[PDB]
Design a protein around this ligand. Structure first.
Ligand SMILES: [Mg+2]
Lengths: 242, 49, 242, 242, 242, 242, 242, 242, 49
């Protein structure tokens, strides 16, 4: 069509970089991951449906620990995602190293923005195709979204991947500021069932969370998940009937 | 960002668009469109009325 | 002319860098930021307006302090701003390190611009995709606009981004050189309203300023944005009644 | 055309990498490999049945000892395997150098992928069009497939190479997660037998395993292999009569 | 032409490097800078109007100080103007560092040409898209024009930018060496009148000059400009009665 | 045309990346060399027919000492051969420097494959368009083919270059593992005979061997090669009747 | 022709480099420079002709001094000359560093043609596109033309430039090895005056010369050209009537 | 052909390197240089033919001293040959330094072939378009021809350049293997005479040689060319009439 | 914008112009006529009369 997407360095007259927009469209062909922030914690949900009976049930399993109160989920290239996750970990331990200071969620998110923006600007390489959901409780719970470019955006609930568009609409209706942990855990599960268009069972999700009180990363176990699933699936069914 | 073939399509296209509103209140000219999806159609044919 | 636009090592036969022309369109696919100069200081306002309520507008920033008497606003990619303000912060401070002197507005504007020129010499790096407005008081107020091309121009009122055209027509009629602090502030707010085409809400605008009298940067909360935003909004209503 | 596929630092308008999607098929162009996980170890089976009587029966090899207790198979281009497994082996002993720790199966593959991430991002170098399956017992058996892109998938049974598609189907009905070591060993072979469409002779196919009692790489010579093969060959016959 | 102009490396059938001569077209668009030599010093006159009247056009500025008897005016990119002037500044102070001599007009010009030229021969980097005139009196008036090519042509009067065309055709008739300090300052001011096609205001213009009997760069304040501007305004108007 | 063999950093959709299979076609065009493995040694044979009486009938060489127990023979460019043969001789010695162990044929082979792959992987440099035969007796006779891809293939007996297919067929029938040094030597002289569709005279071939009961390289003297050839010619003639 | 001129690496099919061909046109666009060597010295004369009276009395500089008794003069791109000559001076100083001898013209010429050769090899850096005639008296007079290609050629009377062809034809008849010091330098003025197609005056030619009998380079004043010019006009006139 | 000749990195599906062959078409543009190797010495004869009578006959030569008992000729670019052969001097020197044994003609050839070989592999820099004839005597005479690839071919009678095809035909017919130094010398004068297609004058040719007994390089004076040339002219005239 | 396409259309256009005020009158016309662009229009029809 043109050659403004034949290079990463080359702007279009529209003002855009289509090469980045096609790193956007690398995200969307990875499956759904959703983060929900409440006034009590931040709760991070990611698909674990992808696979087969053949494969492990704990096949990727996106919700890797970055710090003891920072977890980060992915959508996009599971390749591109792992180095950024491992860099994410290294950036979190540097903050501790050099200050003996629990890593601020906002500042780690900054450091990821800087890290990818070197790969964006530089044309002997390409930018990452992955969007990470950065979440943790510094002493207030936070959820951010980092883009292929390295663009920082603050959210209070968001999703990334193919499931993004369905869920954005869903939270605009249901999401509220009076919400709580317990209520958030059910909401975020409903929204994950919309994305996959089918009902949840406790083993086809992983859910991580950083509470404000504990201020530790904790996984929800399959046994704890089952009752949140029962409650979630109630609305899943309704919104998938016509 | 342009293309040459598109310039053709558009000068044709607007005359499609023109007639469709065009039938005077004297005579009843009804139409049925069909298309692959709205995903390949411009805003100006997706226009109300 | 076709194909003199897919490198930045390349001038076109008409004389002009169209590559740079396409780098000034990224600013305009960003959100407006207006700066207006008064005798009593320098005021910097920026459109924190966000397209939804799942993002939290307050935290998404727009406008950062750079030095203790210089502030700066961005328009363009969030991403490119992160590299550029981190550049800025380090440079402003590097002056204090080897001269013990808070950086001069001209001089910072210049050093950021030399950074931006260097990314415009080499074809190996994508030129910046933002513009900053650099507003502080050194000993006198100065209000610059840096250009993605890595050029600096002194202004006494300026904008960057999509509203650039409208704020120029506005300040062409109503700008005076004899404005006070309260009047300048009001005038800048009115102008931002034209650009978004709608009223101001305290919660989606950020204003930061540096007075000559005080030479300390201070940031306007939503609480204190309130008096100014009633007075501005009446004028916007009248002006956009026509 | 299509692609946007002569550079690896350019994404397709789908958002995909044509270059990597193309390099995925070079694994397939090369010879089959069958990995199978059971609950009493992990068996990796590699196709070494290739060419006429002009070649030796040993054709290297295709099932390298990576570590004491970790092995890998290869399918795809040999040249690319030669260097990949070189790095793999050196990293396995490097963990013991810095930790005196037998490397986990999991971490070893993650870093096989991390090397390959670098040759996917940087356009100064080709992707490796080769896939290793990584079988060992850290202290539980685990089976991974590493991908050219650097995507990483845990299996509990798999095929790669020529039989990749065929054998996925074989195992939907046949493969369970309640198989014995012996059963599994015979079933991975039936499937291998399925791939070439012929009776297997153990004098040109190489099988290794790591058990959970053992925690050591062992290799099955053809005299030993004979009874396994004899129970496979009845079933390969049953299959090719329907 | 075509294809002998979309790189720096390429030579055309003419022998010209059209890339470099297209960065002389970058100069050519915006604005007059005038140099005029005389036998009682050298006077360097430059444009300083920039855009509308929001822009402060009483600063930014072509006539940069470079030494205590060296000044240059710029035409072309503002972006390139800052780095080239900065290098120029570096090279001047290297002569003081190392010889405890202010550098000669000839040698500074000679050097800064070589610097632009280094960058011409390298590919993947371009030459600078700016042109200077190097004005000084070492012990003798000199006036140079240093080219974006990195060539050196000494003149006794020239102009670069938009006004190049007007001032050449004017200086055919008028220019002589019998000019003094005064006759030259007014005569180059007329020259510039013709170039922008208007009468002069000492607000939108700026003059620096290097006199033999002071051996100083001095920068003329607008009150001091004004007497000379009166002399010139009558001449410029009679000549716009064509 | 293909567009997948512009650089080695491109892949085909076929998986058979064309630019290294065009490094393969370079080999084929080159003139023949055959490796024949027996139980009493290995024998290795290569062209020396090249040129007329302008050219030397003592042209050095195609039959390289690599060690005093390892030989190598080649096809493809003798230019690409030269540098590679150089590296082989140092590398082999490098094993000796740091172990004081004779490098085995298998280990030597894997290292030249690794060297080849440095040039194969990088896109700012082309592969060597040369193939190698490595023949030795470490203490078991061994024969490998190393591809211009730097891929490793083991053979009972093998040939490369223009006569590859004729020899291939020749040993298909006749080759056995029960051949003695005499039997296998004369058989490979028949096969070389066929390749050039002509008789053998002792100056068109250079022939070397590594013996089991000495494990040392020795080159057969011109008049010492004359009785093998004398018996071979009988047979080459029978078959060129056909 | 096409595609063999887009870098200096590529050769065309005849074995000609079309990039290099365009570099001789680069010599030929520029001003004529003639060298005439005699037994008693070597005289180097170069065109100082200006298209305006607004260029300097001596425009700097057509004939460089590059060592005690070694000079060169330029034709072709005069931008590149500044760098080329910066280097030529240094190389001739260098030999005076490391053997403390006056460099011979030949070895000086070799070294500068290596510096071209360096930018000819690399395809990143475009080659020199200017030709110099380096002239000096060592053991005996010597005169070279060093070409853009990185070749030296020795001549006994020479030319390059616009006038190149005309002065090859002239000396073919007129030059002889019986010419005195004076009869030679005068003969080059005749050569130069045909070339411009005008009578010569001192301000449109630049002369230096090298004496044997002083063993030193001198640069001849415009005043002391005046007698020779007078002598020259008669022959030039006759030639311009033919 | 068509992009598979426009970079050196490429291959063709012919399996040629078309770029190298074009580099060899460079060898054939330049003039003939011819060598004979006889048992009592080695003979080197170079073209010194001048294009004009203003060209100086002294250097336009091919023949370079390299070692006390090694000379050589070149064909190709002038520029490439002097840099390449100054490398062969160094290399000969290195050998003398570190082993204290003057370099054999064979070893030299392998070393300088491998030097051309880094430039053939690399994409960032072109190969030289030169062939050499490396002639010397170590203990007994040696003669090698270097290809533009870096290929190394041993010869006893050889040519490069333009005149080459006829010299190939010539040494088929005429040369004998019982000939002395004197008799083979004349024959090479008839062969140079053939290629230039006139009866030689001994001022358009140059002879260097190395005899075994002398074990030196000499260069044949005009006095000393004449008996060979007169003898030659007699047989040369006969081939230009028949 | 397209080699055969501007010139073909440019001919229909330059005819239409002759009658408008080329030598030839209004004729009590009273034109009236719609567009949505002003950039694609020749300067010749654009001016008044
Ligand atoms: Mg209508």
């Amino acid at each position: 069509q043109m050659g403004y997407d034949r290079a990463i360095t080359v702007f279009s007259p529209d003002g855009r970089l289509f090469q980045v927009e096609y790193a956007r469209e690398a995200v969307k062909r990875g499956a759904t991951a959703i983060g929900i922030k409440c006034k009590e914690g931040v709760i991070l949900i990611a698909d674990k449906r992808v696979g087969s009976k053949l494969l492990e049930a704990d096949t990727i399993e996106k919700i890797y620990k970055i710090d003891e109160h920072i977890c980060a989920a992915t959508s996009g290239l599971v390749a591109d995602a792992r180095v950024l996750i491992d860099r994410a970990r290294i950036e979190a331990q540097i903050n501790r190293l050099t200050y003996d200071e629990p890593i601020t969620v906002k500042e780690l998110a900054k450091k990821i923005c800087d890290f990818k923006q070197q790969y964006t600007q530089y044309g002997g390489v390409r930018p990452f195709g992955v969007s990470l959901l950065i979440a943790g409780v510094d002493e207030v719970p936070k959820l951010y979204e980092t883009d292929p470019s390295g663009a920082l955006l603050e959210y209070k609930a968001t999703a990334i991947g193919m499931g993004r568009n369905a869920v954005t609409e869903f939270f605009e209706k249901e999401y509220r500021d009076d919400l709580s942990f317990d209520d958030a855990m059910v909401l975020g599960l409903v929204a994950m069932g919309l994305s996959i268009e089918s009902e949840l069972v406790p083993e086809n999700i992983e859910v991580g969370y950083v509470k404000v009180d504990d201020r530790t990363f904790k996984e929800v176990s399959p046994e704890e998940l089952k009752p949140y699933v029962e409650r979630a699936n109630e609305r899943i069914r309704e919104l998938l009937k016509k | 960002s342009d293309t040459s073939g598109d310039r053709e399509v558009q000068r044709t296209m607007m005359q499609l668009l023109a007639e469709l509103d065009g039938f005077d209140p004297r005579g009843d000219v009804k139409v049925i469109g069909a298309t692959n999806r709205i995903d390949i159609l411009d805003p100006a044919i997706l226009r109300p009325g």
